[PDB]
Amino acid sequence: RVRNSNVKRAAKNIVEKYFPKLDCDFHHNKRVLESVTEIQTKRFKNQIAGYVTHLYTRVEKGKVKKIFIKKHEEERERRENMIPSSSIMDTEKIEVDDITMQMIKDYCYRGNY
Amino acid sequence: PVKRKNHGRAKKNRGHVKLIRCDNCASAVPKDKAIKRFQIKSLIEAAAHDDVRTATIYEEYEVPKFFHKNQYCVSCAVHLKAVRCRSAEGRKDRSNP
Amino acid sequence: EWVPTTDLGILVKMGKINMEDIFQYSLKIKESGIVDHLLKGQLKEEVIKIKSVQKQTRAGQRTRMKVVVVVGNGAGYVGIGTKTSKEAATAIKGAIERAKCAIRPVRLGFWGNNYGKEHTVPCKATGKSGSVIMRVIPAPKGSGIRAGSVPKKIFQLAGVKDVFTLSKGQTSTTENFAKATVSALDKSSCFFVPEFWREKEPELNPLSRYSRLIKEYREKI
Amino acid sequence: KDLAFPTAEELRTTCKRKRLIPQNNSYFLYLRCKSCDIIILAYSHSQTRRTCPGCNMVMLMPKGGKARIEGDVKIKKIKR
Amino acid sequence: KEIEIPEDFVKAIILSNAHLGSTTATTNFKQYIYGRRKNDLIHVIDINEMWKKLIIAARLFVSIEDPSSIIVASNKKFGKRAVLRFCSETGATPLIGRFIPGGFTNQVINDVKESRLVVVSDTYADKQTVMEASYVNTPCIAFCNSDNSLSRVDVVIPMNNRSPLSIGCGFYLFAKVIKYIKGEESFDVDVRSEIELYFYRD
Amino acid sequence: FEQRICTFTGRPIPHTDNASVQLTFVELDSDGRATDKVLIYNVCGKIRKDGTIDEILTNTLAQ
Amino acid sequence: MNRLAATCKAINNANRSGKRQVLIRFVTKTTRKFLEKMQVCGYISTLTYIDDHRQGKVIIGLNGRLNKCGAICPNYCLTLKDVEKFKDKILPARQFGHLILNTSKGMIDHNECVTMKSGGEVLGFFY
RNA sequence: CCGGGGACGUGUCCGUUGAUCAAGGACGAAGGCCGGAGGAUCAAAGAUGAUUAGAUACCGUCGUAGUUCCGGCAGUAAACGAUGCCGACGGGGCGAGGCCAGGGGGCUGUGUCCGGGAGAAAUUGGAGUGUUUGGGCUCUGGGGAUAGUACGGUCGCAAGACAGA
Numbered sequence A: 001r002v003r004n005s006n007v008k009r010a011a012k013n014i015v016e017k018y019f020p021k022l023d024c025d026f027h028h029n030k031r032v033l034e035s036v037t038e039i040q041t042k043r044f045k046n047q048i049a050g051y052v053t054h055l056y057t058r059v060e061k062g063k064v065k066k067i068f069i070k071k072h073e074e075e076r077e078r079r080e081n082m083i084p085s086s087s088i089m090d091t092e093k094i095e096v097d098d099i100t101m102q103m104i105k106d107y108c109y110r111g112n113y
Numbered sequence B: 001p002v003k004r005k006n007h008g009r010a011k012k013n014r015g016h017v018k019l020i021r022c023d024n025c026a027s028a029v030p031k032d033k034a035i036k037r038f039q040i041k042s043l044i045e046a047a048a049h050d051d052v053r054t055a056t057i058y059e060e061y062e063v064p065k066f067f068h069k070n071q072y073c074v075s076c077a078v079h080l081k082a083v084r085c086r087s088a089e090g091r092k093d094r095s096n097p
Numbered sequence C: 001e002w003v004p005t006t007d008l009g010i011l012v013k014m015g016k017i018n019m020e021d022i023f024q025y026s027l028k029i030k031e032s033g034i035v036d037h038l039l040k041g042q043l044k045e046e047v048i049k050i051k052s053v054q055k056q057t058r059a060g061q062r063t064r065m066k067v068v069v070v071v072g073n074g075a076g077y078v079g080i081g082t083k084t085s086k087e088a089a090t091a092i093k094g095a096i097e098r099a100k101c102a103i104r105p106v107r108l109g110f111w112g113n114n115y116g117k118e119h120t121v122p123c124k125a126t127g128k129s130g131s132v133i134m135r136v137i138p139a140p141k142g143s144g145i146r147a148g149s150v151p152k153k154i155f156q157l158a159g160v161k162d163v164f165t166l167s168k169g170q171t172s173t174t175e176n177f178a179k180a181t182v183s184a185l186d187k188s189s190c191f192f193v194p195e196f197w198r199e200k201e202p203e204l205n206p207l208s209r210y211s212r213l214i215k216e217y218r219e220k221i
Numbered sequence D: 001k002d003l004a005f006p007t008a009e010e011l012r013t014t015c016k017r018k019r020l021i022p023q024n025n026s027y028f029l030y031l032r033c034k035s036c037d038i039i040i041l042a043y044s045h046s047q048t049r050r051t052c053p054g055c056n057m058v059m060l061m062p063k064g065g066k067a068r069i070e071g072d073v074k075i076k077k078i079k080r
Numbered sequence E: 001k002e003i004e005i006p007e008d009f010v011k012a013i014i015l016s017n018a019h020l021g022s023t024t025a026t027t028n029f030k031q032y033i034y035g036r037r038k039n040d041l042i043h044v045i046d047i048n049e050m051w052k053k054l055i056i057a058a059r060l061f062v063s064i065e066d067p068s069s070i071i072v073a074s075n076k077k078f079g080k081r082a083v084l085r086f087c088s089e090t091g092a093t094p095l096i097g098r099f100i101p102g103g104f105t106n107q108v109i110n111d112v113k114e115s116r117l118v119v120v121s122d123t124y125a126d127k128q129t130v131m132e133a134s135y136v137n138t139p140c141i142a143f144c145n146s147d148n149s150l151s152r153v154d155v156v157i158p159m160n161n162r163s164p165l166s167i168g169c170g171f172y173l174f175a176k177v178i179k180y181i182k183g184e185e186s187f188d189v190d191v192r193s194e195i196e197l198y199f200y201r202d
Numbered sequence F: 001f002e003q004r005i006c007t008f009t010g011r012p013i014p015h016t017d018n019a020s021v022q023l024t025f026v027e028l029d030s031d032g033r034a035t036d037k038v039l040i041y042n043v044c045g046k047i048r049k050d051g052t053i054d055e056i057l058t059n060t061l062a063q
Numbered sequence G: 001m002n003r004l005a006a007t008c009k010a011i012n013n014a015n016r017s018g019k020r021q022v023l024i025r026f027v028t029k030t031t032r033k034f035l036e037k038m039q040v041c042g043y044i045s046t047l048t049y050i051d052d053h054r055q056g057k058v059i060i061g062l063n064g065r066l067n068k069c070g071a072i073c074p075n076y077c078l079t080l081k082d083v084e085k086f087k088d089k090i091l092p093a094r095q096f097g098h099l100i101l102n103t104s105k106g107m108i109d110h111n112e113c114v115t116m117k118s119g120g121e122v123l124g125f126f127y
Numbered sequence H: 001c002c003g004g005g006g007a008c009g010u011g012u013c014c015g016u017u018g019a020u021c022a023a024g025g026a027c028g029a030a031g032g033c034c035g036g037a038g039g040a041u042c043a044a045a046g047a048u049g050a051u052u053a054g055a056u057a058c059c060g061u062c063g064u065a066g067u068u069c070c071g072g073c074a075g076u077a078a079a080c081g082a083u084g085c086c087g088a089c090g091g092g093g094c095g096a097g098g099c100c101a102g103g104g105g106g107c108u109g110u111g112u113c114c115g116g117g118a119g120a121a122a123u124u125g126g127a128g129u130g131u132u133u134g135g136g137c138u139c140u141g142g143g144g145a146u147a148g149u150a151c152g153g154u155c156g157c158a159a160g161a162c163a164g165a
């Protein structure tokens, strides 16, 4: 069945606040949920903890664009710092097409068609 | 009110466009107002094309095309669904897919 | 007590800006508690028209009351706002704060000569709402407000004392007939006359002038 | 951009009557035949055939606007 | 006098293809055009006109007391780090992705500050922000392409926004002139290492 | 009562216009640094939405 | 059309559009003194005729302080006591505005015909 | 073949000869009428076969006028852009017109899209430049119905038309 915003916004908060304490197995993922929240009825725990596992599977792939986890940007900034092959050194004697050089005739360098 | 900016037909800078007969209703519609769908399909349908390969005298026979200009009046063109039901803002589309 | 979430009300609660120099630099009044703080003495709310609008839904006509109100000081400032709600008293206090957010200044002028205090609209202008053309005409002193019942209530709260009016269109449509008559006062006030041909050198607007001063007031809370 | 001082760039683009002063696109010229020593003179937007009288060849033929010049002709504008 | 472009900076914008403008130019853009390529039918933008609109935009930026009041926005994902490397540097407030409409007018939402300037990457992509700025008496600088609309834009920076490096170069250079306007940093920047943070690499 | 004259048009800025914008520009030093004084500019509503506020501000600040 | 009323409408179009110069494709003898009278009250700044041997050309600099200029066709015969009633229709207020009469002293203003004791034909206005 | 036409181009001519219109004149789809010729298709009328509660209709078949041509009458249409003519001014974009120029050009038509302004709104480059109301000229409207009816008139072979309570 389809979960609602009372479950999905809840389970979004659980994976967002408490991501490292979670795991892909559901029964461990429910065992954190009584320890760390207060949810009254045992069916509605299973509604939430089920969708937490359905979130934690795709956040393990990192697919969701909304939620944001402290580990997942510090790993991202390592990926952000590419060893830079910027073409400012790679381009030598820049080939600029015939009319593009004429606009730079006042102050010019690296002239090629 | 005025429903369409061109008043349904493509007539601009004319006084008169000669009527044509509907291909389905035989109504008298002007050539400008008439819905025209030029269909170019093969003479033999695509289901039977394997059966004409076995039966041709000719190696590499090309099945000929069938050329017909369906010209529909407005009443039958919505009934034959040659023109699709669109919204009011969807009416101003002109491009074919 | 009211907490000024808006940036202009920060300077208003601090008394940094007077009423007259809000409209000098054209700063939009988002919140209504700005101007009731400034005009705490004089501000009169007068209900122009209570009428009930209906939409036919599946079962029965959903009927809701739509009120149009006018607020104004004794002289110089006036505003109109309208709100439609289920019950009228909820609609009126919603309309009043909408009118207070939309208070415009009305410059008054002299009819013939500069003696005495100003009493009339300065020029001839026209407010036009949907198909209602209200034209205000400057009147000599003692002539009174020559208008219908609904513009006179706006003309009293705007603080004009002598005006000749002309109307065209469906003035029974009283929301339009009230929205046109403030638009004439809106237009007659900012009519460009030779008294204001004198160029003044432009001044820094107070919200960016006190732009350093506003951020500590949020840091206080 | 000043309306009283139109730049020379915009004047040649705009219409001749719509310029600040109505300026002609036409002129007169001289046609020089090679077999022929004289120089026959003609209009730019000519509406008549021009032929050099001796060693008779056709110099320019009339067209829609500027008359197109026929064959080997040296042309020189005449302005002063 | 007029500030001259570094050969370092003009090295960036040619391989940014920022002068590779667009196929179409409006009459409001023709003053930013020295010429158009007759081969590719592409208008080539004036660099000198591009650079002086940057320093006016930098002049307009610093004129507010607090740069954090300025809300700079970019809809596309090309300029996601171009506005993120900008606001860590310039000290402004970033807006990324879909600008929620009513972000300046509706007072129920208080995610960001009430703007005293906005600068956008594209008026086509951020038509919602440039309209919403005009409702609250807020100025608008914009990077504007050759085909782009420029209504409700105070300062047009004629430059391309349809390349991933292009707004990364433009937001870089706009950050470069800002501290040069304050005198915080001169043009001694060594672009070898700095502009790549603005660049969209994935 | 006073109303802001728009600088570029010369017209008064219209009554309670939201598109009307205050424009502030610091004067620029010879080497290109910021100065404490500020050019203060008043802009009418309709000249923004026409899009004609750009090209006029180019030539005014070019002076 | 009428060359005065075409002049006043073409000025108003450039005036409402915030333009600073309007090129008008024709001058007459009556619109020359109309714009020169519009100049001395400061309503238009820079006025330059152009003699192209045809109808004429005048390039009017727009001062920014012109709300509207118009022409009154037909030119009504107005006595002295009528122009005070006529200025109340045309002008917005008594404190300013210029109603222009083509009287025998000259193409003059409605304030001056009170002084010069003149009637004449009403041409146009500006304020 | 004879005749016409507009746009463009031009140091060609004339020099205000113009704009708009009561009266008046000419043209004016279809259907209709008159005389003559012709008659394939289609087809009012008419005739049938069905349908239907009925069906004088829709559907099928047939069929006359007519549709066709020539000479004339008639003079009407949702004869529509439901938008009079002339003239000044007024934003960009895209198109597949014509002429010119050769410098994303100019004239002149023509659509379209987005804005401005207008508007009760639909919408709209005029339906904009209008209470900040005045370019010229002609026509029309004045709540609905009676009624585009009657009377009188003019026109027409007639049908009727014009005009019009």
Ligand SMILES: [Mg+2]
Residues within 6 Å of the ligand: B015, B016, H079
């Ligand atoms: Mg027709």
Ligand SMILES: [Mg+2]
Residues within 6 Å of the ligand: none
């Ligand atoms: Mg006929």
Ligand SMILES: [Mg+2]
Residues within 6 Å of the ligand: none
């Ligand atoms: Mg017939």
Ligand SMILES: [Mg+2]
Residues within 6 Å of the ligand: none
């Ligand atoms: Mg016969």
Ligand SMILES: [Mg+2]
Residues within 6 Å of the ligand: none
């Ligand atoms: Mg038959």
Ligand SMILES: [Mg+2]
Residues within 6 Å of the ligand: none
């Ligand atoms: Mg009769």
Ligand SMILES: [Zn+2]
Residues within 6 Å of the ligand: B022, B023, B024, B025, B026, B027, B072, B073, B074, B075, B076, B077
């Ligand atoms: Zn049909």
Ligand SMILES: [Zn+2]
Residues within 6 Å of the ligand: D033, D034, D035, D036, D037, D052, D053, D054, D055, D056, D057
């Ligand atoms: Zn020869």
